[PDB]
């Protein structure tokens, strides 16, 4: 990891490596990469806590690999959960 991190193109090689069997959509691959690495969560003297996670919406037409991208991210992330549409209730998403 330390070796490959030195590469000048490493951000682009990571982004190209996101969902490699999906053609194009480099913007989606970038958004997914940013989300999957995430920001830094912060807490200002304990008096104000700030989100580090990056939330992403894939809005668009049918047959454009959006569901496949999400299944890939379920494959790749160290803790992941997947819940389609009508299959998710309010308490089934947060807590019950």
């Amino acid at each position: 990891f330390r070796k490959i991190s030195r590469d000048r193109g490493i951000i682009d090689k990571i982004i190209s490596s996101m969902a490699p069997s999906i053609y194009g959509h480099r913007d989606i691959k970038t958004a997914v990469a940013c989300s999957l690495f995430g920001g830094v969560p912060k807490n200002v003297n304990g008096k104000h806590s700030i989100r580090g996670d990056i939330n992403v919406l894939l809005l668009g037409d049918p047959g454009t690999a959006k569901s496949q991208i999400l299944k890939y991210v379920e494959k790749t992330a160290h803790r992941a959960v997947f819940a389609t549409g009508q299959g998710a209730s309010a308490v089934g998403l947060t807590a019950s």
Partner: protein
């Protein structure tokens, strides 16, 4: 105490829509809030630049040192000391109103009630944001709390001024929110760069009658008119 946070219907406030369409809550539950703030993104560029510099100073970690300097300078106090101080104020003091404070509050109540009445007439419907005798007690509680900060055993004129100001800044501001013939008459009869003294316009329009002040509010929001000279001179400033 109930502190509640909510979004309007349509999420963003949707300013050109009626408040009775934007607000989900019934007038019953709304009346139980001493202060209702309607919060809007102003989109002013100077403000947005200022907020951006501030938020960057947060995320860079500069703010960790800034708050500590502010606390040691005595311009701010910490969570812990403020928590104890709220407890101390809640246990030591419970002030009354002086007679002068009581009269100012009473006359203020009839004043805001009159404002709500005329607004309900001008919009020909009962207002969603209400002003009720329960909301007089809201200004009373706020007055007392303001005196309760300094542990003054009575509230005074100054505390009532601040309580009235806060209620005006919050609940009234929430409540605050054929003419097409008269506006083009005024555009025809007052050309660019000249002044009509207001009372003569009132006499002329009456001689043709409340459409006048709607026309002035619309034309004053636009660049076309400017209410110069203590509102006495209607000045066709713009187009």
């Amino acid at each position: 105490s109930v502190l509640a946070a909510a979004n309007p219907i349509y999420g963003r406030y949707d300013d050109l829509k009626s408040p009775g369409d934007n607000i989900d809550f019934q007038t019953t539950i709304l009346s139980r809030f001493d202060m209702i703030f309607i919060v809007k993104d102003d989109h002013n560029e100077e403000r947005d630049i200022s907020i951006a510099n501030h938020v960057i100073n947060i995320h860079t970690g500069n703010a960790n040192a800034m708050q500590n300097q502010q606390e040691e300078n005595g311009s701010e106090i910490s969570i812990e000391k403020m928590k104890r101080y709220i407890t101390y104020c809640r246990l030591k003091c419970a002030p009354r109103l002086s007679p002068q404070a009581a009269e100012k509050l009473s006359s203020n109540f009839v004043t805001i009630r009159k404002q709500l009445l005329i607004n309900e007439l001008e919009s020909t419907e009962r207002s969603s944001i209400p002003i009720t005798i329960r909301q007089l007690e809201a200004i009373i509680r706020i007055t007392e709390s303001l005196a309760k900060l300094e542990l003054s055993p009575i509230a005074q004129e100054r505390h009532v001024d601040e309580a009235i100001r806060l209620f005006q800044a919050s609940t009234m501001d929430a409540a605050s929110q054929e003419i097409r013939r008269f506006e083009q008459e005024l555009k025809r009869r007052l050309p660019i760069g000249w002044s009509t003294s207001y009372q003569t316009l009132r006499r002329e329009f009456v001689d043709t009658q409340l459409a006048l002040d709607k026309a002035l509010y619309a034309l004053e929001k636009h660049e076309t008119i400017q209410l110069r000279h203590q509102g006495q001179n209607i000045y066709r400033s713009g187009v």
